[PDB]
Amino acid sequence: SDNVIDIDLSEDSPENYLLEHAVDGRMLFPATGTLVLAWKTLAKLKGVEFEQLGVQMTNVQIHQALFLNPGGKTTVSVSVMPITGEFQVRDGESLISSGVITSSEGRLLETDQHMKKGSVLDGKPDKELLFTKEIYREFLLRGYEYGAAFQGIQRASLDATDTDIRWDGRWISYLDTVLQMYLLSKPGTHQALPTLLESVTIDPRVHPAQPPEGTTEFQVLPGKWDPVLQIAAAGGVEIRSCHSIRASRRLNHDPPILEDFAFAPYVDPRPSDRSAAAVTPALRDYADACFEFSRQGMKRWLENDKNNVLPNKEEIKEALAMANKHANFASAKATLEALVNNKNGHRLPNHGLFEMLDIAFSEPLEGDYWDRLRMKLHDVRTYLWDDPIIAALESPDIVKLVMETVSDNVNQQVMEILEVGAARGPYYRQAIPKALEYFSIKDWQYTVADQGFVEDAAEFPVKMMQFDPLDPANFPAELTESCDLLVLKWNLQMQVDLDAAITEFSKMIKPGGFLLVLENGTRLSTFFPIKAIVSASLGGKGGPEGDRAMGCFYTDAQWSALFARHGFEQIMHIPDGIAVSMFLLRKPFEPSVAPIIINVDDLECSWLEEVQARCAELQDSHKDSRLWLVANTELSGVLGFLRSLVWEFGSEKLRCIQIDDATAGPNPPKISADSADFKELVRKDLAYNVFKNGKWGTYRGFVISDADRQKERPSEYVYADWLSAGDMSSLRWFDSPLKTGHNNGMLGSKMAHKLETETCSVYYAGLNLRDIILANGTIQRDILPEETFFKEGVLGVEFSGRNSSGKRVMGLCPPPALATTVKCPVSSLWSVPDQWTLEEAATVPLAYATAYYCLVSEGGVQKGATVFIHAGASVVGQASIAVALSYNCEIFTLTKNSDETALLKSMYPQLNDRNFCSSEDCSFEKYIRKETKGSGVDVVINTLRGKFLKASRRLLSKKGKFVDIGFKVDSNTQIAYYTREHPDLRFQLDALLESQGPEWTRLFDLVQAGIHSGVVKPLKRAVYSMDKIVDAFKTVEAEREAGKIVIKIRDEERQKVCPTPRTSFPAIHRTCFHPDKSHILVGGMGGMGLETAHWMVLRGAKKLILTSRYGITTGYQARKIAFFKQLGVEVEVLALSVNTRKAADKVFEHALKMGPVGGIFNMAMVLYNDDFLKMNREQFLKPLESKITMTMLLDDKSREKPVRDTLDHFVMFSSLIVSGGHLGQANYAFGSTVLEKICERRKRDGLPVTTPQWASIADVGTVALTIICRKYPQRFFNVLSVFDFMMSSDNVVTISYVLVEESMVDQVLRAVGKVLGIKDVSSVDGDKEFIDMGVDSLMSVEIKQALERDAGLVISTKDTQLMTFNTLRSMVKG
Ligand SMILES: NC(=O)C1=CN([C@@H]2O[C@H](COP(=O)(O)OP(=O)(O)OC[C@H]3O[C@@H](n4cnc5c(N)ncnc54)[C@H](OP(=O)(O)O)[C@@H]3O)[C@@H](O)[C@H]2O)C=CC1
Ligand SMILES: *P(=O)(O)OCC(C)(C)[C@@H](O)C(=O)NCCC(=O)NCCSC(C)=O
């Protein structure tokens, strides 16, 4: 109605700086933005200039978020009431801000900060001051992405009190920099969006005028944060009592890929090896049964045949001989159908071969046989391609080992892949999505070819071609020396003359190129029936290796001999054992000049000069020349040294060999010049040869599936939490730190109350409406008592189980009581009478504890009084009635339907139909006001809101008490709580349980008395198993029926005093650190170390020893070290480099004096970057002190007592240079690999070990100061999410890196899908509602404003979470 403001976010608009203010990629309109809009509107209403007006806003609620549209225009409709001052910023029919704005001509500023002249932060050292770089590192880690216009604070103190805010003319930015003093006054790790500024004064007549136009050296106005009054003041601005709401963090990039750098043998892999085929017992049994099906079926073909219709009839008869050589129909299917319908968990992903064998066999013998079934089997060809037998040599592990080992050894910049015969056996469907979509250093070229057009290869990044694959001598001459890798999936068998086929195909391979073949080698009669129908002809020429089986196919042993006979070198060979078999072949390499061997065994780098000289001649040598780096010991970082060296010299003449002495078999290799084992290696000419576990292989990074990050394993102590906040379908069971004895959240306030606690084993956990409210996002955990801020979880309070002595007990404890073990204060634990089962006792404590608090403690009920109870059927409602009846009260209750009324009457016979009303409408007021004869009700237990709350107040007697225990309070009544206008009684039982003072003991005595006197009686119950936690929570939320919901954790024993049997529960990982153990963080005072030490402190660590070469040398370090000490952590900062056994002893001496050493982390780095040839000895060994010299001295200490018995974690941070390499960092690659091998010797001996192998990381360190080797930097809040996975894992090194990535109907769908965090909208189901995937409270508003910004649709927020993708598509068209 009033002034409409147009925010122009264009390329050169003056308000283009408003885009330099984002929260994890969300470009929101500043909360102080609405303050200026309201401020300017009032001035325009008054007619004065907005800079000459002194205003004061009160209770500025940011009702909803405004998402600024980049490169566009947003409109708001500020409206100010003339005399009252009620201002309102809105956009259409949606509210965006509210409050009251008032102008005045007198002093509006409370604090006397507009008078300060200079800056208190003068003359202070650099280690007692924060600067612009360090202040906004703190904000960035919390999700606040400030740009250059919003980076006002130039300096500050370690206390955050004094600042040097900059004044540059813009008011929306200045008021935000004053609101940043509030945010950096509350150190933490979560992301909070301000939503209520209780008072703001912007008196501009005491504020310096706008800078003279053209200024660049803007002045700085001293500011200060008043922790007493909660006032942030700077110049002529003050913001007082600003509150915020926690928000979940959004990942701007895509999820990381985690791999497992592990050794993988090349030839004849044993079952225990990683390159071995994936043959579980279930698959082998399926092949046996299915092979029997082929045997039994093929018998029927030669029995029913009477018209001579069987294609290639003679072949089937010949094949049956093989089946009998390597040995009813109804039983054959019976066995398979038993396997096809079982759900024991040992099932195969799908049974495709049988579906193809069944359709062919079951098909009838009659006319058009050959053509009819040749057109039907071809339609189910997907079954043969996607089958467990065939998917055993196409699994991700084997496919990657193939493509990467080829990529490493191809000495060009583009990997050319040519597959011939792609219509029958396609290898692009496996090669591309499993191995070639993870490439980041080599670009690939895939060419599919066959007789016709490849239909299924249409969606893949391939190029098509046409020639005859089944006939040689006709392959186009344009393909000579055209591909580095040749793929022949199920193609060589269809040739008639193999010798003519191989010799011609070998002309395809470039010099040093590779060839790949997949063929059936064992049990050759199993797949024939499909082949017989599909193959037009089955006539082929045998060879010296033997006559071709059937007309096509050749036994594995024959293939190997044939390829060997034709002068091929077997680089790899993976025999599946059930059917197919893979060969990866390459021609021999005969050097014309003797190879050069340089032993790189030494770790002191006595070989550096030799390598430097002999690698400087690589650019002027014969192509056949080579340089081999040989290491005959386990500890040698030559696999990262080469991979970084090959970046500066090419892969034509750089090779390495590493013999692992520890794992070398009884016959170790004898690689020495004119040796025997060496000559074999030279012929293969592979860039990476490692002898480990008695086989030649290569170190490869195998991708860890994303499903394993949430895999559940047995755990003794577990507790329920949520994976994503605000989603009730994401509740899982995580590991509980109570395995360490103590509990998380022992920081800050929780250390002031030294309550004596009894460790209890939870048998039943009660579910209240408090837990559902927190779980489904209706309330953030910050509303709870401050003592629960750092707790592991906030779900569950009541329980019933057995104490440490075996007695049966029940009570209330600070959360999480929804666990299997709790530490309940001894003053909150009642004893179960010897008439209630542990199931019944789980319903009493909270329901009756709140009933007594509402009536006897807060309402002061008296005998004969009249009480009004809302929601009589609820658990607290039922408890309230029982207490009141014991007090001989007159009861009026609100019952939803007649079932609830009947239920209550049955439970309490004293209730007639006169004591019941209806909650459907506020018609009870007349009834209660007539039956009480106008006196009203003495006590009102209120849960309903809105008009029912008003009517309930009006029923109060003159001395009546109103107890409001509802959870979904309004906005005005939420302000009342903040400003101390009303008391917040909806989380008082929680607050009492933290303190457990005189107020609580009154309730403990009352409930305890109630048990004895018979008032306290168990309520109705509904037990839910542990795994049905999600269903239990939904049942409580719906409130479709009355009764308690209790989760059964264990089974109550028959005895009454007996020990709890030790059992395990399935739960997700959660790393925890012992509070009584000291943790060493070597080099932990920098970048990732300080933000990792923060993570450990939140997860249990309370004893840290941070080590550095100098000490605390920056203001950011001194601030966080002071922050930890404030939280109750004992931090000792040592300025000692551990580069000598003496120093290592000193560091651990200061450790054992704090507590048993229960962790050693090395996050040290000293980088020197330069080309390998220009680096002297001293310059080379610079990054080799924190990664080699240290890690061996820290390793040695952990191997010797008393640390060995006590040590629990041993983490050695590494980088991707070990697996990807880099240029100039030959030294850092060498050291980083030796750190990766010292962490595998620990695994051989069984000691704990972990070695994260990171990639570019953001927000903290080296990169912090983007895209290197095409890999995007990770967000640290993800670095710590995967790091938690890394610690609770069995592997040594876990690679973690991030790789960089129409109609109007599809336009908005992609945008809407992007909000939810979906990369392919089409992939997910079109019938699955948004709430099912997950839509918290900010994704819905973004979609709501996007469906209007992008299209004309205007939807409701609630409608967003219950609408499918199909609904959205069908709605935009309308
Ligand atoms: N940052 C990234 O993006 C990546 C990180 N990593 C790994 O993660 C860690 C990153 O830490 P980051 O802080 O980023 O590196 P920084 O260079 O940012 O700081 C590293 C710390 O190492 C400490 N340090 C170096 N040498 C010694 C020594 N001899 N004795 C004690 N302390 C020492 C320094 O303390 P002072 O300066 O006081 O001596 C410095 O604070 C490293 O271990 C690195 O290998 C892996 C891949 C990439
Ligand atoms: P639901 O629980 O209804 O969610 C309420 C939300 C959407 C969080 C709403 O209250 C909101 O968006 N408030 C935030 C307003 C805001 O963005 N203020 C600060 C500006 S951005 C900044 C600090 O970077």
Residue 976, burial from CB neighbour count under 10 angstroms (0-12, 13-18, 19+): middle
Residue whose tokens read 């006595």: 606
CB 578 within 8 Å of CB 522: yes
Q: At a CB cut-off of 8 Å and minimum separation 6, what does 683 contact?
A: 569, 588, 589, 590
State the Cα–Cα distance between residues 1354 and 623, nearest whole angstrom: 69
Structure tokens at 856: 């006897």
Contact residues of ligand 1, CB 6 A cut-off: 1082-1083, 1085-1089, 1107-1110, 1113, 1137, 1163-1166, 1185-1186, 1213, 1215, 1254, 1256-1257, 1260-1263
**Ligand in closest contact with the CA of 1112:** 1
DSSP, residue by residue, 858-874: IS---TT-EEEESSTTS
Q: How far is the CA of 64 from the centre of ligand 2 (A)?
A: 6
Residue whose tokens read 């978020």: 65
| Candidate of 1338, 1342, 1344 to mutate for ligand 2, largest count of ligand atoms within 8 Å of Cβ | 1338
Q: How many CB atoms lie within 10 A of CB 360?
A: 20
How does DSSP classify residue 547? P
Q: At a CB cut-off of 8 Å and minimum separation 6, what does 122 contact?
A: none
Asked if residue 195 has its Cβ within 6 Å of ligand 2, the reply is yes
Structure tokens at 702: 């195998």
Q: How far is the CA of 1097 from the centre of ligand 1 (A)?
A: 20
Helix (H, G, I), strand (E, B) or coil at 528: helix
CB 919 within 8 Å of CB 944: yes
DSSP, residue by residue, 309-352: --TTHHHHHHHHHHHHHT--HHHHHHHHHHHHH--SS---S---
What are the beta bridge partners of residue 704? 258
State the Cα–Cα distance between residues 883 and 859, nearest whole angstrom: 12
State the Cα–Cα distance between residues 137 and 1259, nearest whole angstrom: 7
**Ligand in closest contact with the CA of 1212:** 1
| Candidate of 1169, 1262, 1271 to mutate for ligand 1, largest count of ligand atoms within 8 Å of Cβ | 1262
Spatial CA neighbour of 1186 closest among 1264, 1071, 1083: 1083
Tell me the CA distances in angstroms from 217 to 211, 350, 1179, one per residue in order. 9, 70, 41
Spatial CA neighbour of 264 closest among 697, 702, 701: 697
| Candidate of 1165, 1182, 1279 to mutate for ligand 1, largest count of ligand atoms within 8 Å of Cβ | 1165
In the sheet that holds 1078-1082, the strands lie side by side as 1130-1135, 1103-1108, 1078-1082, 1157-1162, 1210-1212
Asked if residue 193 has its Cβ within 6 Å of ligand 2, the reply is yes
**Ligand in closest contact with the CA of 1090:** 1
**Ligand in closest contact with the CA of 1186:** 1
**Ligand in closest contact with the CA of 1297:** 1
Asked if residue 194 has its Cβ within 6 Å of ligand 2, the reply is yes
905 sits in which H/E element: helix 898-907
Q: How far is the CA of 1317 from the centre of ligand 2 (A)?
A: 19
Q: What stretches of 18-93 adopt beta strand conformation (E)? A: 21-23, 54-61, 72-76, 79-80, 86-91
Asked if residue 89 has its Cβ within 6 Å of ligand 2, the reply is no
State the Cα–Cα distance between residues 1098 and 617, nearest whole angstrom: 55
CB 678 within 8 Å of CB 1254: no
Asked if residue 608 has its Cβ within 6 Å of ligand 2, the reply is no
State the Cα–Cα distance between residues 448 and 458, nearest whole angstrom: 10
The HSE-up count of residue 1303 (CA atoms within 13 Å, CB side) is 6
Please report the atom of ligand 2 found closest to the CA of residue 192: 23
Residue whose tokens read 């990639």: 1255
Q: At a CB cut-off of 8 Å and minimum separation 6, what does 711 contact?
A: 1068
C-alpha angle 671-575-571 in degrees, rounded to nearest 5: 35
DSSP, residue by residue, 651-686: SSSEEEEEE-TTT--SS----SSS-HHHHHHHHH--
Asked if residue 62 has its Cβ within 6 Å of ligand 2, the reply is yes
924 sits in which H/E element: helix 924-931
State the Cα–Cα distance between residues 1261 and 1087, nearest whole angstrom: 4
H helix runs in 1137-1275, sequence order: 1141-1152, 1177-1180, 1190-1199, 1203-1206, 1226-1244
Terminal-residue alpha carbon distance, the chain: 30
Q: What stretches of 919-982 adopt beta strand conformation (E)? A: 937-942, 956-964
| Candidate of 197, 245, 967, 1361 to mutate for ligand 2, largest count of ligand atoms within 8 Å of Cβ | 245
Please report the atom of ligand 2 found closest to the CA of residue 63: 10
Spatial CA neighbour of 824 closest among 759, 767, 768, 752: 759
State the Cα–Cα distance between residues 806 and 810, nearest whole angstrom: 12
Q: At a CB cut-off of 8 Å and minimum separation 6, what does 599 contact?
A: 607, 630, 631, 632
State the Cα–Cα distance between residues 1133 and 1090, nearest whole angstrom: 12
Sequence positions preceding breaks in the chain, C–N over 2.5 Å? 327, 1265, 1301
Q: How many CB atoms lie within 10 A of CB 935?
A: 13
Give rounded-to-5 percent helix, strand, coil for the chain. 35, 20, 40
Q: At a CB cut-off of 8 Å and minimum separation 6, what does 815 contact?
A: 784, 788, 791, 793, 794, 795, 796, 797, 990
Chain center to CA of 123: 45
Q: How many CB atoms lie within 10 A of CB 506?
A: 16
What does residue 426 show for φ and ψ, rounded to 5 degrees?
-90, 125
Q: At a CB cut-off of 8 Å and minimum separation 6, what does 763 contact?
A: 799, 800, 801, 802, 838, 842, 1048, 1049, 1050, 1051, 1052
Q: How far is the CA of 140 from the centre of ligand 2 (A)?
A: 18
Spatial CA neighbour of 249 closest among 165, 193, 180: 193
Is the sign of the CA dihedral 493, 494, 500, 501 positive or negative? Answer: negative
State the Cα–Cα distance between residues 101 and 55, nearest whole angstrom: 7
The answer to whether the bond into 1202 is cis (omega within 30° of 0) is yes
Tell me the CA distances in angstroms from 688 to 571, 764, 1225, one per residue in order. 12, 58, 19
Q: How far is the CA of 62 from the centre of ligand 2 (A)?
A: 7
Q: At a CB cut-off of 8 Å and minimum separation 6, what does 140 contact?
A: 146, 1259
State the Cα–Cα distance between residues 548 and 541, nearest whole angstrom: 7
| Candidate of 17, 23, 28 to mutate for ligand 2, largest count of ligand atoms within 8 Å of Cβ | 28
C-alpha angle 483-387-446 in degrees, rounded to nearest 5: 15
Residue closest via CA to ligand 2's atom 9 equals: 64
What's at 1184, amino acid-wise?
A: L
Q: Phi/psi zone of residue 1100: left (φ > 0), alpha (ψ -120 to 50 degrees), beta?
A: left
**Ligand in closest contact with the CA of 1296:** 1
DSSP, residue by residue, 1320-1343: -TTTS-TTS-HHHH---SSHHHHH
Q: How far is the CA of 688 from the centre of ligand 1 (A)?
A: 29
Is the sign of the CA dihedral 669, 672, 676, 679 positive or negative? Answer: positive
What's at 348, amino acid-wise?
A: L
Chain center to CA of 669: 44
CB 1248 within 8 Å of CB 1266: no
Asked if residue 23 has its Cβ within 6 Å of ligand 2, the reply is yes
Helix 844-852 × helix 998-1013 angle, to 10°: 110
DSSP, residue by residue, 1269-1305: TTEEPBPHHHHHHHHHHHHSSS-SEEEEEEE----HH
Is the sign of the CA dihedral 543, 544, 545, 550 positive or negative? Answer: positive
State the Cα–Cα distance between residues 828 and 230, nearest whole angstrom: 35
Count of residues in the chain? 1374
Q: At a CB cut-off of 8 Å and minimum separation 6, what does 1001 contact?
A: 827
Q: How far is the CA of 1164 from the centre of ligand 1 (A)?
A: 4
CB 534 within 8 Å of CB 374: yes
Structure tokens at 274: 């990683």
State the Cα–Cα distance between residues 1115 and 137, nearest whole angstrom: 12
Please report the atom of ligand 2 found closest to the CA of residue 1338: 7
Residue 1182, burial from CB neighbour count under 10 angstroms (0-12, 13-18, 19+): middle
Tell me the CA distances in angstroms from 1214 to 639, 1172, 1229, 1295, one per residue in order. 14, 21, 10, 9
| Candidate of 126, 261, 1088 to mutate for ligand 1, largest count of ligand atoms within 8 Å of Cβ | 1088
Structure tokens at 1224: 């100039």
Tell me the CA distances in angstroms from 1066 to 422, 712, 715, 1106, one per residue in order. 45, 5, 6, 35
Q: How far is the CA of 1262 from the centre of ligand 1 (A)?
A: 8
Tell me the CA distances in angstroms from 188 to 184, 185, 399, 605, 1098, one per residue in order. 9, 10, 44, 45, 10
**Ligand in closest contact with the CA of 1216:** 1
Residue whose tokens read 């030790």: 1062
Tell me the CA distances in angstroms from 1148 to 1143, 1144, 1209, one per residue in order. 9, 6, 15
Q: At a CB cut-off of 8 Å and minimum separation 6, what does 102 contact?
A: 55, 56, 57, 58, 85
**Ligand in closest contact with the CA of 139:** 2
Structure tokens at 243: 């509150």
Residue closest via CA to ligand 2's atom 10 equals: 64
What does residue 75 show for φ and ψ, rounded to 5 degrees?
-120, 135
Q: How far is the CA of 65 from the centre of ligand 2 (A)?
A: 5
Q: How many CB atoms lie within 10 A of CB 1286?
A: 21
Map 108-121 to HEC letters: CCCCCCCCCCCCCC
What does residue 897 show for φ and ψ, rounded to 5 degrees?
-125, 180
